[PDB]
Design a protein around this ligand. Sequence first.
Ligand SMILES: [Zn+2]
Lengths: 751, 87
Amino acid sequence: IRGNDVIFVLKTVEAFKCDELERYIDNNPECTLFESLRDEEAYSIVRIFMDVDLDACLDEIDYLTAIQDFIIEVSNCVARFAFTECGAIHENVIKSMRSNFSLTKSTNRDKTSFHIIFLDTYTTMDTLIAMKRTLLELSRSSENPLTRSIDTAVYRRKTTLRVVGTRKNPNCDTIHVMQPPHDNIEDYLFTYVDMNNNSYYFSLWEPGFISFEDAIKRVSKIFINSIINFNDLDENNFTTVPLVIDYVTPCALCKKRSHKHPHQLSLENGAIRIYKTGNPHSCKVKIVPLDGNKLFNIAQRILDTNSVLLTERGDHIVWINNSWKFNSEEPLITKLILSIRHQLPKEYSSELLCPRKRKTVEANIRDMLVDSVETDTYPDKLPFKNGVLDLVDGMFYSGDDAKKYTCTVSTGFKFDDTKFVEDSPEMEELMNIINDIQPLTDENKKNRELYEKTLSSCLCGATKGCLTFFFGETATGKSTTKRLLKSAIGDLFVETGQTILTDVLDKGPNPFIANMHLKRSVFCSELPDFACSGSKKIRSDNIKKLTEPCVIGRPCFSNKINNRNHATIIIDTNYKPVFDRIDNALMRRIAVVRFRTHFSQPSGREAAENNDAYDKVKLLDEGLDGKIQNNRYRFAFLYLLVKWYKKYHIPIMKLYPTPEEIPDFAFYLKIGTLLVSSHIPLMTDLSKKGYILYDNVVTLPLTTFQQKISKYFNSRLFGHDIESFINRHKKFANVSDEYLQYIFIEDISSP
Amino acid sequence: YLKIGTLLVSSSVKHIPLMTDLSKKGYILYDNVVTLPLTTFQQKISKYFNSRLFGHDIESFINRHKKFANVSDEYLQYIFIEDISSP
Ligand SMILES: [Zn+2]
């Protein structure tokens, strides 16, 4: 659509532009033109507009407060309707609606009418048609005289709206005068679509009220004083007889001792309006409802601010003090009900001070929350205690903006821009520490890049399909890297023991199984070396099961077993891992990060001078570990992590395994590179080489195979591995021995 | 475990000039480094400390932190303190 600059009008027809309409209006002040839609189907996208009419006069203060509350209520209700039905964003709609709006007026001083248009919000006419019932409920479920007077009509096909500055009728001289700051004729058109940057768009007496006597009693209680002309009002004289009151005490509505004329009660929109006659500003207007609870309307107003949603599992997440809290032990809805009373009208705030009413208006909220939402869906954002830091752009959001993202976890500490710097001595000290841990030589280049990549994945809410191994001799200070990462990433990071590396992953109630829920990094240290006999091999089942994007595990006294998996798993030790089970999936799901830095004191430095444990040796310092424990380089290291993530995270970043540094998998690699599955039309070459083919399957004797492979590989090194491989690929039968099928790649190449 | 390193020394990688001299005392000097036989290393370990109270710990420590100049052979890369120190 890209907006429309043509305004179609009806004289009781034309298609004029902004300048054309302005010139025509200036030429003819008395012309009556109604702005409508030239074609309903073509340009159904229009602005959001409302028309309000209340036949009474109000002063400046009352009008100001009433219009403020009217904007608040209408914007919240429309944003809630957009969120539930049109799939929009609540915060965006609220911001667009409250940012800028055009408000007209009426030249008549005996009544208050206007047409209000929200400039930046645009939606299809079908959406405004569907909003009919919701807006009618809002109109009939409020106390504000402006909100109660909303005309739900004008939401029909091919509707028309009276243009500003033109008389509605030739006989009626009253016209609507524009108000600051718009002052332009294009700012009061409900079809003038002007989509731009700061904008948003979305799309898909009746007896039945109450007994008369109770209404009369309510009116009398409002008047406080007794009615002089009592026992005279009935069904017929409801809006005819004046209400004469004795001025025993000053009027509750006006606070004055007396007035020139009595009051009068009228019926409108299922409510009773009490107003004085003669001078209009002598007494205010009193509104009396005729249906609905008072505790249900409060629940609706608290609900349609989108602050008490429920999760996809069944937990009600509330928004208190700029953070999405939630607890399943002491539910927080009553805290929210108490703390939100300031954003509610005067009559709705005194109710939320009795604890027996903040349980009624809370049962209502729980009964109105049907269907769920999804939490922590955007993985490129880091939730801090006072907001959300964006990673792709680096901009920080605080306050209601962070509400847009259902961040159910947090790092635990606030975000400070002063410490968040680039050129600081702490940054240089951290860079020196990292260089000491990771020398930047060309030999280390690839390993250092893998280090930076696997260390920067901690700022990702997505799931990763690899498990990097920190392999390095002692005194390499991997604990320093662990401490720096913990200080940078807050309480999201978790350190776990080897309990998951040996036992069954799910099995029974495992605390680390549930703790992997939404934690962004899991670290294991000092692995139980399986080189010595007795220690269990690294459970291949657990490693395979930890890679999936889901976690299945239920702790003691619980039933939930589904957890979202975001943690990057890192294992650090000085011993090569040993896994009893081996398959191609394992060979494609293991990465190794090598450490070649020795941090040793001078006393043993000579002992480390010729040591083969590390490719370099340098003096250590006991005064650094405490510094890392004191969150010294926290924000500089966080900046480094952000830079690494930016330089590494392409539109799709993946953890690539490195199956070359693991000594155990080298045997399988050598076997595969020298022997694979056995090619029918190559019998002559096999016969020349000595091998024979029988029953369409080339075979050799088991003793012959052992003799052939004796020289190719060291039998004493991996005799158990060779026996296990033979058992796995065993075939048996045939001739007078077992059957072994393979191709000697080294012999296959040689003719 | 604590006392094993007290009477043990790191591999003398940078002892190429002295590796040849140490080889004549019962080392193979393979891969430009002095390497003693696994049986010889076990005998030296049993001589260093009472073999009655020292059993599988020495073998486990050797398998953890020693090599036989190849993938696996009958040698040991564990450098004796009383031998590797002397050129
Ligand atoms: Zn009054």
